[PDB]
Amino acid sequence: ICTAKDIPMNPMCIYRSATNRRVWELSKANSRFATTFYQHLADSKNDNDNIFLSPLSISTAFAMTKLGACNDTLQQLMEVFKFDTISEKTSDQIHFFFAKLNCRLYRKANKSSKLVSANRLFGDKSLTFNETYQDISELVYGAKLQPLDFKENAEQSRAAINKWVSNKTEGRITDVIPSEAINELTVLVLVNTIYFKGLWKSKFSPENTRKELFYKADGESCSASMMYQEGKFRYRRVAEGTQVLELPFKGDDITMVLILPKPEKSLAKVEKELTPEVLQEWLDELEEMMLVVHMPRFRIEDGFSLKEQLQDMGLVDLFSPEKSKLPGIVAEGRDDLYVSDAFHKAFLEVNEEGSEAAASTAVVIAGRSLNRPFLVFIREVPLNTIIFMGRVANPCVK
Numbered sequence: 079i080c081t082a083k084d085i086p087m088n089p090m091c092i093y094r095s096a097t098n099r100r101v102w103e104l105s106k107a108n109s110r111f112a113t114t115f116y117q118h119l120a121d122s123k124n125d126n127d128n129i130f131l132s133p134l135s136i137s138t139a140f141a142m143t144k145l146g147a148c149n150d151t152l153q154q155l156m157e158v159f160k161f162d163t164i165s166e167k168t169s170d171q172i173h174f175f176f177a178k179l180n181c182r183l184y185r186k187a188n189k190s191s192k193l194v195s196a197n198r199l200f201g202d203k204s205l206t207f208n209e210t211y212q213d214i215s216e217l218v219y220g221a222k223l224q225p226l227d228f229k230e231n232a233e234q235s236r237a238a239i240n241k242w243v244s245n246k247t248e249g250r251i252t253d254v255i256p257s258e259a260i261n262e263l264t265v266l267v268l269v270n271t272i273y274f275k276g277l278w279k280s281k282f283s284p285e286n287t288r289k290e291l292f293y294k295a296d297g298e299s300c301s302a303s304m305m306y307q308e309g310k311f312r313y314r315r316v317a318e319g320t321q322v323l324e325l326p327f328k329g330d331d332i333t334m335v336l337i338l339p340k341p342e343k344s345l346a347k348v349e350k351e352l353t354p355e356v357l358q359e360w361l362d363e364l365e366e367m368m369l370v371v372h373m374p375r376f377r378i379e380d381g382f383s384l385k386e387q388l389q390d391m392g393l394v395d396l397f398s399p400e401k402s403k404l405p406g407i408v409a410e411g412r413d414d415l416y417v418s419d420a421f422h423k424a425f426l427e428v429n430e431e432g433s434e435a436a437a438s439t440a441v442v443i444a445g446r447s448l449n450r451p452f453l454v455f456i457r458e459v460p461l462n463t464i465i466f467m468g469r470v471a472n473p474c475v476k
Contacts, residue, residue: 079174079178079181079217079218080177080185081178083217084174086174086217088170088173088174088210089170089210090145090147090148090210090211090406091148091149091152091169091405092168092170093149093152093153093169094167094168094169095156099165100164100175100178101175101178101179102462103163103165103175104164104179105179105462105463106160106164106462107160107161107163107164108133108134108137108463108464109133109354109462109463109464110160110163110354111136111137112133112137112354112464112467113352113354114391115136115387115391116129116133116349116352116467117349117350118387118390118391119131119382119387120349120469122386125345125346126449126450126471127469127471128378128380128468128470128472129380129468129471130379130380130426130437130454130466130468130469131380131422131424131437131467131468132272132424132435132439132465132466132467133464133467134272134463134464134465135270135272135422135437135439136270136384136439137159137176138176138180138219139197139270139420139439139441140155140158140439141159141161141172141176142197142219142221142268142270143155143396143417143441144156144159144172144173145173145211145214145215145218145406146208146405146406146407146412147396147403147404147406148403148404148405148406149403150395150401151395151402152169152403154392154395155393156169156172157392158388158393173214173218173219174218176218176219177217177218177219179461179463180195180219182460182461183195183458183461188329189329190277190327190328190329191274191276191277191327191328191329191331191332191432192274192275192276193274193329193332193458194273194274195270195272195273197219197220197221197269197270197271198222198242198269199212199215199221199222199266199267199268199269200226200235200238200239200266200267201225201265201266201267201408202225202227202229202264202266203225203226203228204229205265205408206409206410207266207407207408208406208407208408208409211407221268224242226238226239226267228260228261228262228263228265229262230262232260232261233260235260235264236255236260239254239255239267239440240252240253240254240255242269243438243440246271246273247437247438248273250273250425250434251271251423251424251425251436253423254269254381254421254422254440255267258446259418259419259421259442259445259446260445261445261446263444263445264442264443264444264445265407265415265443265444266407266442266443267440267443268442268443269438269439269440270438270440271436271438272436272437272438272465272466273435273436274332274434274435274436274466275432275433275434275435276329276434277327277329277431277432278327278328278430278431278433279327279328279330280307280309280325281307281430281431281432282305282306282307282371282373282375282429282430286305286307287304287305287430288303288304289301289302290302290303290304293450294449294450295449295450297449301474302374302376302474303375303376304373304374305371305372305373305374305429306370306371306372306373307371307373308368308369308370308371309368310367310368310369311323311324311325311366311369311371312364312365312366313364313367313369314363314365316363318343318347318348319339319341320338320339320340320343320348321336321337321340322335322336322337322360322361322363322364323335323336323337323338323369323371324336324364325373327432327433328432330459331458331459331461332457332459333456333457333459334433334455335455336452336453336454336455338452338453339451345451345453345469349453349469357455373428374428375428375429375430375473376427376470376472376474376475377425377426377427378426378470378475379424379425380422380424380426381422381423381424382421382423383419383420383421383422383448384419384420384421384422384439385417385419385420385447388420396416396417397416398416399416399444400416402414402415402416402417404416407443415443415444416443417441418443418444418445418446419442419445419446419447420439420440420441421438421439421442422437422438422439423438424437424438426468435456435465435466437466449471450471451471452469452471453468453469453470454466454467454468455467
């Protein structure tokens with residue numbers, strides 16, 4: 079709906095609880111879901127484990143899912159993704175703000191870094207989806223509905239979807255859908271993708287990079303290539319000796335924030351207390367300063383279902399075959415569609431030239447159920463959005 083093509087129409091179940099304040103609002107909601115998501119996730123993983131995701135991707139894919147949700151399934155969706163925090167209830171205006179949001183995000187607010195996003199739907203080549211549902215998906219999310227033979231060729235189906243994502247992620251993301259997620263009973267598959275590649279506004283030089291000794295929790299040793307640089311950066315040593323460092327990209331509208339808990343300190347606290355407000359506070363305190371950066375040259379992949387975590391977060395209905403409500407999707411009889419499962423997969427690569435991240439979130443309808451430090455944040459400055467985020471627990475990567 080990117081002011082090229084408010085005014086536009088959209089019809090389905092609607093729930094009730096410059097105007098950029100709505101977009102800025104949306105960004106906050108999005109950010110609120112991110113920190114809360116990160117926690118659960120963290121709380122579920124081993125402290126010394128890697129974490130990497132694009133909460134933004136999760137947001138989108140779920141907003142896309144929201145398009146055909148009904149009374150309560152919709153409500154949860156609204157509350158969980160914090161949609162109900164923006165001003166003016168209008169369930170339908172969410173998608174519009176998202177449209178505007180994504181707009182500014184991927185469309186020509188440019189050229190110093192690569193910020194692309196693609197979305198798509200994959201329904202059964204035999205069913206008849208709601209035309210409006212289809213049209214609003216392509217209009218808001220730019221999501222086209224690709225017919226896939228789930229009944230007769232589910233495996234091939236998955237594979238196809240995975241190949242699409244791979245195309246859309248520069249090969250970075252393959253495998254978003256696991257080996258048995260798609261079956262004969264899959265009606266549709268909502269998919270989002272995000273791809274970033276950026277150049278360091280101030281880059282490290284391979285000449286200063288040095289390999290070195292990396293110890294793990296009770297585990298032996300590994301080798302890490304540590305980058306080095308000296309320069310003026312927006313830094314700040316916050317409470318408890320926690321460090322906060324900002325590394326912008328040539329595409330200065332985009333930056334990478336590092337949060338290092340005081341050496342030997344449990345990352346757990348900081349994380350445990352994570353709020354967008356706490357974050358924003360850190361930011362607001364950053365001062366420019368000459369310093370030496372010891373940063374690793376590394377890569378990290380992250381994959382996982384979202385079902386469990388989102389369930390704990392209040393997303394229950396959506397997942398129940400019995401109480402799920404997604405009536406506005408298939409033209410005839412859309413009266414039995416739960417989200418079997420949802421998957422996420424993120425890739426992160428950091429080196430001397432810059433950084434490169436990618437992720438995918440794919441919601442499947444009626445399918446088959448089932449080493450010390452670091453915090454990363456790739457954010458959109460003007461837009462106040464967390465694109466990517468994670469924990470780097472192993473720089474000597476496999």
